[PDB]
Amino acid sequence: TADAVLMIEANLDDQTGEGLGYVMNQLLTAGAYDVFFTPIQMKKDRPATKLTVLGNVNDKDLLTKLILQETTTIGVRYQTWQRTIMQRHFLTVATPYGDVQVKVATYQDIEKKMPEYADCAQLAQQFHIPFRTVYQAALVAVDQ
Amino acid sequence: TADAVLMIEANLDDQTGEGLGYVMNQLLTAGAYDVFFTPIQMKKDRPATKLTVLGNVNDKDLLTKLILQETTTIGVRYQTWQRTIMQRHFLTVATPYGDVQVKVATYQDIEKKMPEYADCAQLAQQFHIPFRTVYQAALVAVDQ
Amino acid sequence: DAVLMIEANLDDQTGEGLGYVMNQLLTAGAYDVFFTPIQMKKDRPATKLTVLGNVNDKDLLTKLILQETTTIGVRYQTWQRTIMQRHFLTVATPYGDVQVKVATYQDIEKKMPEYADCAQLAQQFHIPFRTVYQAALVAVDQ
Amino acid sequence: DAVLMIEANLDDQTGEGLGYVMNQLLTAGAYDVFFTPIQMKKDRPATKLTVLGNVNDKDLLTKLILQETTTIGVRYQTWQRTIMQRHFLTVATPYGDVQVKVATYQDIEKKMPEYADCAQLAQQFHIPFRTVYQAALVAVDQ
Amino acid sequence: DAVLMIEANLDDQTGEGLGYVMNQLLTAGAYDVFFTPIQMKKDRPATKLTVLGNVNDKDLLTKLILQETTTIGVRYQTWQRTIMQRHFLTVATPYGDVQVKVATYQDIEKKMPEYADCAQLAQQFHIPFRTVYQAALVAVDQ
Amino acid sequence: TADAVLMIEANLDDQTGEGLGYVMNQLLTAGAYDVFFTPIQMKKDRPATKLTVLGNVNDKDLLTKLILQETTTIGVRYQTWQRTIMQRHFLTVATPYGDVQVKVATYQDIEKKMPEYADCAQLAQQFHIPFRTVYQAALVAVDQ
Numbered sequence: 001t002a003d004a005v006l007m008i009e010a011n012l013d014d015q016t017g018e019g020l021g022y023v024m025n026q027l028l029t030a031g032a033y034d035v036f037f038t039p040i041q042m043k044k045d046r047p048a049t050k051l052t053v054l055g056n057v058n059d060k061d062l063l064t065k066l067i068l069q070e071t072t073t074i075g076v077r078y079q080t081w082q083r084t085i086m087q088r089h090f091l092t093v094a095t096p097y098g099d100v101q102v103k104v105a106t107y108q109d110i111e112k113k114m115p116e117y118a119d120c121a122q123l124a125q126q127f128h129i130p131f132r133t134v135y136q137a138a139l140v141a142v143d144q
Numbered sequence: 145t146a147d148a149v150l151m152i153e154a155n156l157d158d159q160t161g162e163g164l165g166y167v168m169n170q171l172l173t174a175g176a177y178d179v180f181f182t183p184i185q186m187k188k189d190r191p192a193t194k195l196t197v198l199g200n201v202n203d204k205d206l207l208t209k210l211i212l213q214e215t216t217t218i219g220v221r222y223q224t225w226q227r228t229i230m231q232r233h234f235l236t237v238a239t240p241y242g243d244v245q246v247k248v249a250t251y252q253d254i255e256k257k258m259p260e261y262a263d264c265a266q267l268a269q270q271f272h273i274p275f276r277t278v279y280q281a282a283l284v285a286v287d288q
Numbered sequence: 289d290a291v292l293m294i295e296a297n298l299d300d301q302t303g304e305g306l307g308y309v310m311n312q313l314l315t316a317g318a319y320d321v322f323f324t325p326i327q328m329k330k331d332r333p334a335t336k337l338t339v340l341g342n343v344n345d346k347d348l349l350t351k352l353i354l355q356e357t358t359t360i361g362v363r364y365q366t367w368q369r370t371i372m373q374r375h376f377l378t379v380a381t382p383y384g385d386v387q388v389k390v391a392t393y394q395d396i397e398k399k400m401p402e403y404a405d406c407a408q409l410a411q412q413f414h415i416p417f418r419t420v421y422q423a424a425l426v427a428v429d430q
Numbered sequence: 431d432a433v434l435m436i437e438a439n440l441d442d443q444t445g446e447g448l449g450y451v452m453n454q455l456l457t458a459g460a461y462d463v464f465f466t467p468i469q470m471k472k473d474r475p476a477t478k479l480t481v482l483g484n485v486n487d488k489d490l491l492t493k494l495i496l497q498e499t500t501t502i503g504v505r506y507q508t509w510q511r512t513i514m515q516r517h518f519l520t521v522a523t524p525y526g527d528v529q530v531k532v533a534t535y536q537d538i539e540k541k542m543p544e545y546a547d548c549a550q551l552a553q554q555f556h557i558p559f560r561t562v563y564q565a566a567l568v569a570v571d572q
Numbered sequence: 573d574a575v576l577m578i579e580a581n582l583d584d585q586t587g588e589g590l591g592y593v594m595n596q597l598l599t600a601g602a603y604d605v606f607f608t609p610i611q612m613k614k615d616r617p618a619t620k621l622t623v624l625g626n627v628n629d630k631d632l633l634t635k636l637i638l639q640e641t642t643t644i645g646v647r648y649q650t651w652q653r654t655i656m657q658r659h660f661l662t663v664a665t666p667y668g669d670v671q672v673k674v675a676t677y678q679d680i681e682k683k684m685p686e687y688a689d690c691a692q693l694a695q696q697f698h699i700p701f702r703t704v705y706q707a708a709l710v711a712v713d714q
Numbered sequence: 715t716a717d718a719v720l721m722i723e724a725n726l727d728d729q730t731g732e733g734l735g736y737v738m739n740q741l742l743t744a745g746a747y748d749v750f751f752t753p754i755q756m757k758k759d760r761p762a763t764k765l766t767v768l769g770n771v772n773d774k775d776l777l778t779k780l781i782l783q784e785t786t787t788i789g790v791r792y793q794t795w796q797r798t799i800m801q802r803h804f805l806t807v808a809t810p811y812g813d814v815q816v817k818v819a820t821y822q823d824i825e826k827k828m829p830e831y832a833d834c835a836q837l838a839q840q841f842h843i844p845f846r847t848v849y850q851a852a853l854v855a856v857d858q
């Protein structure tokens with residue numbers, strides 16, 4: 001239920017968006033819990049991007065080294081956050097378009113059920129149905 | 145003068161803006177010092193929102209539970225910040241349009257005086273005057 | 289039916305003032321008002337204000353912007369639009385009736401439960417907004 | 431050659447859904463698709479969707495937006511454009527050939543190594559993307 | 573008096589380069605230049621560049637953009653504008669004279685103390701910018 | 715290689731962009747390692763700016779006091795981040811347009827070389843060449 005997460009950041013005013021899209025995908029294949037970009041505004045009228053990576057506290061060296069190798073930054077800053085995470089498991093749910101996996105999260109008496117995006121998007125593509133139509137059909141089916 | 149503040153964050157790529165506007169207002173009625181949204185850019189070409197909540201360090205359970213109940217997130221991250229806060233009190237200031245409350249903040253020999261928005265906005269609405277006209281009239285009156 | 293778009297960049301106004309003008313503009317009958325974060329000269333974080341409205345409301349919306357913001361001028365233009373046909377359905381849920389906007393286009397049909405109904409009933413019955421939103425989707429499903 | 435721009439503001443759709451529609455629109459032949467973060471009424475963080483495309487693809491791109499997003503209508507307009515002349519050069523590097531887009535305008539000449547080639551070879555040879563990008567610049571220099 | 577707007581999306585240029593082009597464009601006589609953060613294909617954080625200027629400066633501003641940025645083309649259009657009447661007042665403060673822009677529209681009258689004067693005197697007299705700005709408002713009040 | 719950095723933040727919904735551009739430059743002349751702005755979305759439909767300042771851990775009082783004097787904020791929050799920084803030195807590199815300084819950063823066996831912006835921008839201005847043309851000429855020359 002309770003763990004910790006490492007957050008690593010770096011500001012980039014000297015790298016292309018092309019290069020940043022590449023490193024986002026390098027970081028996820030490296031096992032980062034999450035990667036995101038925040039538009040920031042830096043000195044000398046430069047539009048810039050802040051890179052944030054969340055990962056296991058023990059992955060400090062891995063993620064740091066990846067960032068210094070693949071981005072233009074000279075340094076990284078990092079710090080540990082505490083976390084509260086719900087318990088999670090999966091249910092196979094039958095819908096009008098086929099089976100969809102649904103993540104079931106519980107925390108004390110809080111409970112929510114989230115259809116898997118990739119499952120819904122594949123079925124929307126296959127059957128030429130809007131993604132939102134399939135996702136909602138999965139939500140109805142979850143209501144069971 | 146010196147205290148600490150708890151910061152709680154969560155990234156949301158699976159929730160509507162409608163839902164986020166609702167939770168912002170749920171969080172403030174719950175006693176959060178501040179709530180804000182930051183546009184971020186997440187994996188799989190998803191535009192997302194980071195939710196940040198500042199509050200009392202002792203409100204960890206309250207604010208965490210509210211977020212997990214009202215948002216789609218599976219976990220939250222949180223951490224404690226130190227703070228330096230000016231001393232604050234209120235003055236009733238008479239202006240050409242009626243009384244306006246002004247927050248007077250002092251820190252060592254730093255001092256600034258901030259007219260209350262709601263007081264100025266009500267009077268601008270009532271008398272059909274631009275908000276900035278009333279706010280500046282309150283700033284002049286503060287100069288006393 | 290065409291729409292008027294009015295824009296103005298603001299680097300010399302507080303956020304407090306901008307929240308005020310959004311609500312003045314909405315009560316004046318603007319179709320929509322939104323802010324876009326921009327970055328302007330001399331290292332200024334700024335905001336672009338966009339107002340969408342009826343073309344015949346050009347003078348009203350212009351006047352409010354020039355009165356309530358710091359901008360010296362506004363720029364405007366008309367956009368053509370394509371709008372789906374729209375009607376509303378009221379659906380019964382365990383929490384009361386919820387109106388659902390039903391939009392159609394050619395062979396498109398989609399359903400957006402009304403925000404005001406889901407939020408009102410969510411507060412009233414002390415349940416998450418998503419709980420009421422989903423019950424309206426279930427109710428629609430029959 | 432003119433370009434069509436289509437816009438729609440979305441405060442009632444998930445990011446997951448928006449990533450899906452960007453890829454539907456790109457596979458439909460849109461020139462470009464991008465998102466702009468906006469701030470809408472009632473404290474809603476929102477996204478503006480912009481689609482750039484061929485003017486003759488107006489009905490296709492409109493239909494996809496109204497089918498796959500939550501918007502009730504779209505607004506559109508045509509922009510004039512000025513486009514540089516463009517050709518491609520293949521340059522030999524220690525990692526293989528890399529195509530380079532060469533754009534010219536009057537007396538302007540500039541070189542952008544092709545992203546797909548630099549990324550493919552960077553993964554293949556386990557070197558940073560910038561390492562391959564720079565080697566293509568060196569290769570261009572002779 | 574109408575205004576020209578030129579746009580271009582950039583996912584393949586550094587921020588360093590973009591700060592350079594903003595200052596080239598301003599010295600070339602652009603009315604305004606600003607950046608808007610956008611999100612483009614293939615998970616790229618990007619920047620939209622907007623240039624506002626005189627319609628007769630279309631070719632100059634286009635040439636600078638195609639020379640100094642990575643974009644292959646630009647899109648442009650003309651917006652109509654409504655501009656308030658404007659004049660300037662010099663007001664005496666404890667820190668020197670400060671020019672105040674006075675803008676009027678119908679029965680609107682508003683006052684924006686000039687940034688360059690408040691900033692120059694704030695540095696000169698080692699006081700906050702807001703302190704000089706407010707003293708100009710007081711000075712205006714009589 | 716390994717140090718720490720102090721991060722100070724403040725949200726501003728009651729200050730002009732003009733005022734923020736001024737304080738960014740006040741902060742850099744004060745010796746901040748970095749200053750940046752993040753657009754955020756605050757209560758009551760206010761578009762706002764978050765101010766972030768990175769600096770030496772021992773500059774807490776300096777940077778705090780500057781912010782409370784020059785911005786509208788009533789308080790600041792701050793916290794210490796750990797950092798991993800590459801070793802850095804400078805090389806004078808001869809290019810087709812004159813000498814350009816290049817920062818050479820190394821970390822274990824990671825190495826990258828970054829031409830100085832001001833050197834390239836001056837030469838682009840002087841010789842009426844695009845900045846990107848000069849910067850790339852410096853990158854080629856670095857490849858040595």
Ligand SMILES: Nc1ccn([C@@H]2O[C@H](COP(=O)(O)OP(=O)(O)OP(=O)(O)O)[C@@H](O)[C@H]2O)c(=O)n1
Nearest residue numbers: 033034035054088103116117118155188218219
């Ligand atoms: N910051 C995060 C985000 C992810 N997770 C965990 O890692 C998994 C990945 O989250 P998710 O968004 O579901 O990843 P994917 O399934 O790969 O992608 P998608 O968003 O399409 O579902 C989740 O189960 C979550 O519990 C985490 O620990 N920390």
Ligand SMILES: Nc1ccn([C@@H]2O[C@H](COP(=O)(O)OP(=O)(O)OP(=O)(O)O)[C@@H](O)[C@H]2O)c(=O)n1
Nearest residue numbers: 177178179198232247260261262725758788789
């Ligand atoms: N991050 C924050 C922001 C607020 N405050 C305190 O909480 C009060 C709320 O701040 P304020 O913005 O003034 O709230 P309101 O008065 O409700 O709204 P408004 O902005 O319109 O004045 C302030 O006095 C401030 O001292 C705080 O401790 N931490």
Ligand SMILES: Nc1ccn([C@@H]2O[C@H](COP(=O)(O)OP(=O)(O)OP(=O)(O)O)[C@@H](O)[C@H]2O)c(=O)n1
Nearest residue numbers: 162291318319320340402403404439472502503
């Ligand atoms: N860009 C827009 C936005 C709105 N409208 C018109 O304005 C009405 C109000 O729009 P909406 O945002 O839905 O207002 P509410 O329903 O009050 O807000 P909510 O999103 O909470 O449902 C719409 O039905 C539509 O007719 C429009 O024509 N063009």
Ligand SMILES: Nc1ccn([C@@H]2O[C@H](COP(=O)(O)OP(=O)(O)OP(=O)(O)O)[C@@H](O)[C@H]2O)c(=O)n1
Nearest residue numbers: 018433460461462482544545546581614644645
């Ligand atoms: N605003 C735009 C964007 C694209 N195009 C056309 O679409 C093509 C594809 O654009 P691009 O972004 O370069 O696609 P890719 O080359 O596939 O992507 P990448 O950036 O990775 O090279 C361009 O050559 C151009 O002819 C256009 O006319 N107008």
Ligand SMILES: Nc1ccn([C@@H]2O[C@H](COP(=O)(O)OP(=O)(O)OP(=O)(O)O)[C@@H](O)[C@H]2O)c(=O)n1
Nearest residue numbers: 297330360361575602603604624686687688732
């Ligand atoms: N969108 C714009 C912006 C500027 N201008 C013209 O350009 C002049 C310069 O604009 P401004 O931003 O005020 O320049 P400065 O006064 O130099 O900058 P500052 O904001 O620091 O006062 C204005 O007076 C106006 O005539 C314009 O016509 N259209």
Ligand SMILES: Nc1ccn([C@@H]2O[C@H](COP(=O)(O)OP(=O)(O)OP(=O)(O)O)[C@@H](O)[C@H]2O)c(=O)n1
Nearest residue numbers: 011044074075747748749768802817830831832
């Ligand atoms: N957050 C940061 C950023 C800067 N630095 C250090 O401070 C110096 C300033 O960084 P840089 O961006 O190179 O500053 P300038 O050279 O002044 O400006 P420019 O970006 O144009 O090179 C760098 O050498 C870097 O090592 C730092 O310690 N912490």
Ligand SMILES: [Cl-]
Nearest residue numbers: 075076077719
């Ligand atoms: Cl750092």
Ligand SMILES: [Cl-]
Nearest residue numbers: 005219220221
């Ligand atoms: Cl997290």
Ligand SMILES: [Cl-]
Nearest residue numbers: 362363575624
């Ligand atoms: Cl304008």
Ligand SMILES: [Cl-]
Nearest residue numbers: 324466608620
């Ligand atoms: Cl726009």
Ligand SMILES: [Cl-]
Nearest residue numbers: 291340504505
């Ligand atoms: Cl519209």
Ligand SMILES: [Cl-]
Nearest residue numbers: 433482646647
């Ligand atoms: Cl274009």
Ligand SMILES: [Cl-]
Nearest residue numbers: 149789790791
């Ligand atoms: Cl705070």
Ligand SMILES: [Mn+2]
Nearest residue numbers: 013014588831
């Ligand atoms: Mn730098």
Ligand SMILES: [Mn+2]
Nearest residue numbers: 092094098099
């Ligand atoms: Mn099955």
Ligand SMILES: [Mn+2]
Nearest residue numbers: 103116117118
């Ligand atoms: Mn998943």
